[PDB]
Amino acid sequence: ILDGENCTLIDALLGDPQCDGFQNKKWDLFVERSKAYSNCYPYDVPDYASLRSLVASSGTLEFNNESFNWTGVTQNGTSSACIRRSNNSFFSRLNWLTHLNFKYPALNVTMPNNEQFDKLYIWGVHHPGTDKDQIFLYAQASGRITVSTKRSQQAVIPNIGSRPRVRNIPSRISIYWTIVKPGDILLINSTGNLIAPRGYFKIRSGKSSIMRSDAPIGKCNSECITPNGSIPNDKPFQNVNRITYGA
C-alpha cells in the first residue's frame, strides 16, 4: 500500500514539490484521499480519466532521466505559483523551456528507443493568459506543437486568452502523453510553448490499481481492500461496497 497523503496520482506523477517524496515509488494499491489538493501551476489534462487509469495500472513511478538536445533555449523554467523551499520551482519531471536572447529557434529534437520496453513520455503545452505574456516568454506571437512517432501524431495549437485566475494564475498547462514502443522513435517539433519532458517513465503491466478512500492505513493482513476498509473474505458475498480490490 502507498497511502497518497496530500497528493493525487497525477500530481505525484508530475512531481509537485509538496509531493516530492513520491519518487521512484512502487505500489500494489494507491490510496487517494479526498482531502488532496494541488499547489503547483494550474493544469488540466485532456482525457484525464485515461491518463490517471494508465498510470495507476502500471503501478510504478520509476523515472529515468534522458538527455534531449535542447540547444538554443533556456532550460529549468520556474514559477511563483509552485514554490518548493521558498524558492521558485516547477514540476520536477517537466522541463519548462523559454527563450534565450529573445529567440526561440524551431526545435526538431529526436530521441530513439533502443531498449526492449515501452516508454511513457509526459509533456505539456503552455497557454498564456495574454498575447502580451506570450511574447515575454517565447518571443513568438503564434505557436504550434507536433510530436510524432511512427504510429501516431499529436498536433496541439496553444490558445492565448485569459481564464479565471486560480491562485493568481490566468494561464494553464495542458498535459499530454505519448507511448513509444521498442524500435520506434519520438520526434518533437515545436515552435514554442512546449513544456518539455526530462525523460521517460517505465511502463509495466500488472495487478496495480488506484482507490479513493478516507480510511486510515493499518498494520494488518487482509486480502481485499475497499474504501470502507479491509474486509474478511471467508464469506462468498458482501454488501459493504461495490468498489473493491483483491480476492
Epitope: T78, S79, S80, G129, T130, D133
Partner: antibody, heavy 123, light 108 residues
C-alpha cells in the same frame, strides 16, 4: 500600471540601500520590473531586472554580487539590496516595466517608469 | 556605455532635421533593434521609438528612426524649442547576458 518608488535618503558607511517600487494594478502576470540607475552627470546603465512570477532575477555582471532583487505576494513590492556601498553609487535609481511588440529582432523596451529614489553616499 | 553614442553634441539647429547616429559591431548588429528614450531634465525618461520605426501612444510625427545594417539613427524630422532633452538608445548584447546597453546619450 503606475510604479511607486520613493525614500532611501542616505546610507554612508556600508551596505544599507533598500528600495521598494510597489507596482499598482498590472494585469498581465508575466511582467517585469527592471531597475535602472542614472548617476548625476552620466547617462543610464542597466543594473538589475526581475519577473516576480518567473524566477531567478537577472543582473548585468558588473554588479553580480553587490545586488539582490526580490518580490512579495500580498504586496507587489520589488526589494533591491546593495552590498558594500562605495562613493561610486551616488545616483537616482528608477524602476521600469517592460513592454512588448511582435517583430523580428524582438527586444523589450521600458514602457512605464517610476520616479526615482535619491540614494546618496557621503561622510 | 557599450553602444557608441554621439558624445555630447546634437548641434541644435533651427527648425531643420536633426539626426543622432549610434552604431556598434556584432552583438548589436546580429539582428537586434534599437529604441529611443527622451529624458526631460530631471523627470523619468519617456519612450519615443521602439523597433526602430514605431511610435508609442502619444508621440507626434516629428520623431522617426531607422536601423540600416550595422548602425541606427534617430531622425527628428521637425523640431521645436520645447523638445530640448536627452536621447538614449537601447540595444541588446550577446556577451552572455548583455541586456540593456544604453550609451551616453546626446543632448538637445
Amino acid at each position: 500600471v503606475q510604479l511607486v518608488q520613493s525614500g532611501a535618503e542616505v546610507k554612508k558607511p556600508g551596505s544599507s540601500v533598500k528600495v521598494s517600487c510597489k507596482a499598482s494594478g498590472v494585469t498581465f502576470t508575466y511582467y517585469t520590473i527592471s531597475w535602472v540607475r542614472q548617476a548625476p552627470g552620466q547617462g543610464l546603465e542597466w543594473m538589475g531586472g526581475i519577473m516576480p512570477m518567473f524566477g531567478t532575477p537577472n543582473y548585468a555582471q558588473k554588479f553580480q554580487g553587490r545586488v539582490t532583487i526580490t518580490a512579495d505576494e500580498p504586496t507587489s513590492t520589488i526589494y533591491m539590496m546593495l552590498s558594500s556601498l562605495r562613493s561610486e553609487d551616488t545616483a537616482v535609481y528608477y524602476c521600469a516595466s517592460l513592454g512588448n511588440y511582435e517583430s523580428g529582432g524582438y527586444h523589450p523596451y521600458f514602457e512605464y517608469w517610476g520616479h526615482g529614489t535619491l540614494v546618496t553616499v557621503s561622510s | 556605455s557599450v553602444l557608441t553614442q554621439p558624445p555630447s553634441v546634437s548641434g541644435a539647429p533651427g527648425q531643420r532635421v536633426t539626426i543622432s547616429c549610434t552604431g556598434s559591431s556584432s552583438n548589436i548588429g546580429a539582428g537586434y533593434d534599437v529604441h529611443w528614450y527622451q529624458q526631460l531634465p530631471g523627470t523619468a525618461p519617456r519612450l519615443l521609438i521602439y523597433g526602430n520605426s514605431n511610435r508609442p501612444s502619444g508621440v507626434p510625427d516629428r520623431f522617426s528612426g531607422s536601423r540600416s545594417g550595422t548602425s541606427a539613427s534617430l531622425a527628428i524630422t521637425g523640431l521645436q524649442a520645447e523638445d530640448e532633452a536627452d536621447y538614449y538608445c537601447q540595444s541588446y548584447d550577446n556577451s552572455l547576458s548583455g541586456s540593456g546597453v544604453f550609451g551616453g546619450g546626446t543632448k538637445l
